[PDB]
Amino acid sequence: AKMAFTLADRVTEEMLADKAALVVEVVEENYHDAPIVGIAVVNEHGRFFLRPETALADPQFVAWLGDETKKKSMFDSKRAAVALKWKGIELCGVSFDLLLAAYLLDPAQGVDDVAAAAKMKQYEAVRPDEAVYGKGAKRAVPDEPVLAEHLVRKAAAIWELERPFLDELRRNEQDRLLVELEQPLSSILAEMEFAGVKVDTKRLEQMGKELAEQLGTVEQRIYELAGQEFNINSPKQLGVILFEKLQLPVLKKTKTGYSTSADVLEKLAPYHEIVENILHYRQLGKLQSTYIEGLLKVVRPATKKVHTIFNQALTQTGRLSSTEPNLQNIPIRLEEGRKIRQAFVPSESDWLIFAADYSQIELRVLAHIAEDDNLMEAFRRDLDIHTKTAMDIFQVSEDEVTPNMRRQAKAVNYGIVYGISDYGLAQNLNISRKEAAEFIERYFESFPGVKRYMENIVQEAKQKGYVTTLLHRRRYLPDITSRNFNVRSFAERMAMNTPIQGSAADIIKKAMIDLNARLKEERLQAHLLLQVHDELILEAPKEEMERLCRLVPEVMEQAVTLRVPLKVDYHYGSTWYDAK
DNA sequence: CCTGACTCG
DNA sequence: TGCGAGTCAGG
Ligand SMILES: Cc1cn([C@H]2CC[C@@H](COP(=O)(O)OP(=O)(O)OP(=O)(O)O)O2)c(=O)[nH]c1=O
Ligand SMILES: OC[C@H]1O[C@@](CO)(O[C@H]2O[C@H](CO)[C@@H](O)[C@H](O)[C@H]2O)[C@@H](O)[C@@H]1O
Ligand SMILES: [Mn+2]
Numbered sequence: 001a002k003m004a005f006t007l008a009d010r011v012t013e014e015m016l017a018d019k020a021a022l023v024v025e026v027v028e029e030n031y032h033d034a035p036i037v038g039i040a041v042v043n044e045h046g047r048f049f050l051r052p053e054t055a056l057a058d059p060q061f062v063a064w065l066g067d068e069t070k071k072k073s074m075f076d077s078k079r080a081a082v083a084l085k086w087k088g089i090e091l092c093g094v095s096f097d098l099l100l101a102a103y104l105l106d107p108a109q110g111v112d113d114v115a116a117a118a119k120m121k122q123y124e125a126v127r128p129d130e131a132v133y134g135k136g137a138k139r140a141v142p143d144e145p146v147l148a149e150h151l152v153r154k155a156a157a158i159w160e161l162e163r164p165f166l167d168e169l170r171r172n173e174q175d176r177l178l179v180e181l182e183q184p185l186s187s188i189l190a191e192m193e194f195a196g197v198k199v200d201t202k203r204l205e206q207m208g209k210e211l212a213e214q215l216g217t218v219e220q221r222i223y224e225l226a227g228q229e230f231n232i233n234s235p236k237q238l239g240v241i242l243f244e245k246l247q248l249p250v251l252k253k254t255k256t257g258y259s260t261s262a263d264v265l266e267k268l269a270p271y272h273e274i275v276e277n278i279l280h281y282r283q284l285g286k287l288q289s290t291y292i293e294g295l296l297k298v299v300r301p302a303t304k305k306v307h308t309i310f311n312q313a314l315t316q317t318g319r320l321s322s323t324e325p326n327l328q329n330i331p332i333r334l335e336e337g338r339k340i341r342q343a344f345v346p347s348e349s350d351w352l353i354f355a356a357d358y359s360q361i362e363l364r365v366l367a368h369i370a371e372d373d374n375l376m377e378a379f380r381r382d383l384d385i386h387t388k389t390a391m392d393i394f395q396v397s398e399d400e401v402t403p404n405m406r407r408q409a410k411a412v413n414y415g416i417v418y419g420i421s422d423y424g425l426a427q428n429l430n431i432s433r434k435e436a437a438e439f440i441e442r443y444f445e446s447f448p449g450v451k452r453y454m455e456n457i458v459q460e461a462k463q464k465g466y467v468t469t470l471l472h473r474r475r476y477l478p479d480i481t482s483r484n485f486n487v488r489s490f491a492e493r494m495a496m497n498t499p500i501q502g503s504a505a506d507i508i509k510k511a512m513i514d515l516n517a518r519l520k521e522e523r524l525q526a527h528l529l530l531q532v533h534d535e536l537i538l539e540a541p542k543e544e545m546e547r548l549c550r551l552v553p554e555v556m557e558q559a560v561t562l563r564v565p566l567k568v569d570y571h572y573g574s575t576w577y578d579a580k
Numbered sequence: 581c582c583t584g585a586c587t588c589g
Numbered sequence: 590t591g592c593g594a595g596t597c598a599g600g
Contacts, residue, residue: 329588
């Protein structure tokens with residue numbers, strides 16, 4: 001009662017059925033240009049293991065991999081597709097992805113390997129990757145016999161688990177979410193990641209040289225003001241300087257000691273001008289370590305491109321995340337940091353960068369879901385709640401509202417709708433707690449629909465134990481009925497936010513699928529490069545800008561039909577920076 | 581390896 | 590005492 005399989009030395013016709021569980025093993029966490037250590041195939045005819053050098057050089061196997069009519073069931077097909085792209089091979093026909101299936105059933109399980117998915121169905125005939133490859137410096141590919149069995153067992157699990165997972169997804173009304181959204185999206189993300197984004201290293205490097213000089217100046221200035229030399233990047237050392245040497249008041253403490261957070265330092269500005277210099281130093285230091293040095297470290301020298309990896313099965317709300325490098329958190333709020341974007345350029349001769357951003361996205365989604373008359377009316381009148389809130393908070397006229405003021409108001413708007421307390425708001429706007437409370441109270445008096453929705457969604461979560469999004473994404477909240485006030489409150493706030501942020505994620509994901517389809521149909525050369533939660537970034541020859549200015553906004557705005565209209569802002573230019 | 585600092589949505 | 594993320598230097 002074990003698991004017999006074949007360790008083939010050549011490709012046979014039987015292992016090329018029109019349906020099978022396929023394992024194309026890429027052990028390196030970052031699969032870009034990473035080695036494929038082994039292949040496994042399980043179908044109606046049997047179980048097979050193939051060495052990469054064998055299978056990938058076989059004309060029939062390569063043809064099979066690229067045959068869309070030959071359906072494959074896998075785990076993390078994007079990892080396989082990309083790794084194969086780097087090997088010059090195209091993968092088609094992926095009909096089921098166990099990773100995405102597990103992710104949709106319950107994001108909280110943190111499924112990261114076949115074994116973890118299998119556990120959801122009490123399937124034991126497979127071991128966890130870590131148990132096979134090892135941890136850290138001990139991580140290595142085992143002897144062929146061991147490797148082969150593992151890959152085959154993972155293929156066997158995928159083969160036996162497909163039906164059970166599709167079954168539970170259907171019951172949860174998430175089967176289409178998988179097959180028509182996440183899986184198609186996965187292929188689109190694979191293309192985006194492989195294409196990469198070109199970097200102007202000469203300019204980036206020059207920026208780093210100049211930035212290093214500015215840092216040295218701010219650094220010395222800080223020591224001068226402190227009357228002592230110390231490690232500014234050490235909250236511990238900085239705390240001694242600020243709260244022990246300079247005697248500044250302690251406004252907050254964490255479990256390790258005095259807090260030197262940006263919020264605390266800003267509140268200390270009236271006492272000593274050293275805190276402002278420190279804030280500036282930390283800003284510049286981050287740009288240098290992360291957006292200059294860190295970014296240069298991941299640039300592929302030969303092409304000057306960076307290839308991020310969009311984790312599609314990680315966030316608890318359905319959003320994507322971006323790693324090594326994270327291209328979803330590149331500076332833009334402050335002018336100094338924003339310049340880093342001048343280093344992100346088109347990959348071709350006379351191409352340009354085109355960026356589209358959903359206007360007040362989650363407020364529009366909230367209007368729809370909460371069905372708040374006043375909020376829905378506002379969007380039907382095409383108003384800007386962020387600007388309006390800015391006008392009130394700063395007590396200024398619309399024309400006076402600066403981009404930075406709107407941004408601060410935007411943070412306030414979402415903080416309030418998502419349950420910020422009067423304490424939190426008073427601290428953020430450094431204003432009276434009573435006034436903050438009044439502002440919040442008044443805020444919901446104007447948007448009574450939103451208030452009741454938030455109260456109802458919390459009660460619903462307590463009764464059902466989970467919340468859902470527009471396209472049926474789900475998130476369980478077991479802590480929602482906890483005895484502990486803190487534990488419970490956090491769960492209640494998740495119930496308030498997840499459905500909104502999650503539905504916003506559903507929308508942009510559908511937009512990406514529709515756009516990719518529209519682009520291909522019109523044979524446009526324009527292609528997606530990045531997704532930044534509620535914005536899409538593309539590159540395309542200058543001649544296509546005219547079409548994009550209409551095609552991109554239209555597709556994104558028509559992705560889904562809500563009670564309120566969806567609006568998209570867009571721009572383009574020679575660099576990401578200019579796409580403003 | 582952990583915090584706490586910075587970055588973005 | 591709003592939510593969701595990732596990377597870095599210092600300990
Ligand atoms: C910045 C920010 C954003 N979010 C969530 C919810 C909004 C989405 C999209 O961000 P965006 O700045 O475009 O917001 P949008 O409302 O789309 O603003 P624009 O009209 O696009 O400028 O991310 C948040 O929770 N807290 C924040 O401070
Ligand atoms: O291939 C991405 C996919 O793999 C998982 C593990 O199943 O994450 C791995 O790869 C990521 C990208 O390099 C790393 O950030 C992560 O540390 C590594 O375990 C999934 O989480 C992800 O969806
Ligand atoms: Mn937006």
